[PDB]
């Protein structure tokens, strides 16, 4: 998973 | 715990929910391409940190999507017009894609390590979204014996669902893509949504008989939905  | 209930952004939708999406379930919509699905799910992408008082759960956001569907400007402007920072409201959201639906079912093994993570900071996980819950099931697992196979798959990956939202206290918000019927569903609570005249949308929910009958109606905005 990935900020943004 | 008790639950939690996080707004739509529509006091007709809220009312048929009775406050809004629920944690510690899992909550399916489904409905045709183009029904808005993917709208409400942006949407509650941002109502969610709202604090309580305005109808949110001060939470971060996990989104697994399987359609490239996930739109970070559209969650900046339904941010920016519900009096919230664009960009912090985006640094909450923790996003993946999924390759295919076996990478889809370890995502959820690997969100609740980030889950975990939040859990007692002032901005926990509240909100998981899959979107789409089934379109590498469809595109997977077709023909003879896939619809005993593909519901086992499917169940499996919904079980793994119901246990993070309870364990959590996080709600589950999925999405389904339907044309034509008769399949089992194990979701908690089942909203059919549909576009109307004039580009209204249309929930109601399906199998239901202890929640309110009617439909709430409301359109697609700057806001994310509003009546």
Redesign the interface.
């Known amino acids: 998973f990935h900020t943004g | 715990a008790t639950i939690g209930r996080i707004s739509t952004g529509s006091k007709s939708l809220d009312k048929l929910l009775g406050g809004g999406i629920e944690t510690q379930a899992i909550t399916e919509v489904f409905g045709e391409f183009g029904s808005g699905k993917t709208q409400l799910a942006h949407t509650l992408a941002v109502m969610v940190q709202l604090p309580p008082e305005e109808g949110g759960l001060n939470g971060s956001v996990?989104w697994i999507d399987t359609e490239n569907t996930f739109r970070?400007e559209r969650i900046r402007e339904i941010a920016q017009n519900r009096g919230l920072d664009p960009?912090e409201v985006?640094?909450h959201?923790?996003?993946?894609r999924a390759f295919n639906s076996n990478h889809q079912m370890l995502?959820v093994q690997?969100?609740e390590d980030?889950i975990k993570e939040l859990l007692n900071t002032d901005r926990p996980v509240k909100l998981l979204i899959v979107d789409s819950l089934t379109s590498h099931f469809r595109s997977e697992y077709i023909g003879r014996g896939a619809l005993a196979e593909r519901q086992q798959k499917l169940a499996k990956h919904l079980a793994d669902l119901h246990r993070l939202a309870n364990l959590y206290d996080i709600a589950v918000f999925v999405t389904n893509q339907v044309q034509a019927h008769i399949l089992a569903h194990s979701a908690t609570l089942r909203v059919y949504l549909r576009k109307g005249k004039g580009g209204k949308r249309i929930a109601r929910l399906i199998d239901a008989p202890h929640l309110p009958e009617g439909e709430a109606v409301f359109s697609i905005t700057e806001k994310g939905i509003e009546d």
């Open positions: 996990m970070p960009d985006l640094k959201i923790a996003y993946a995502l690997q969100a980030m």
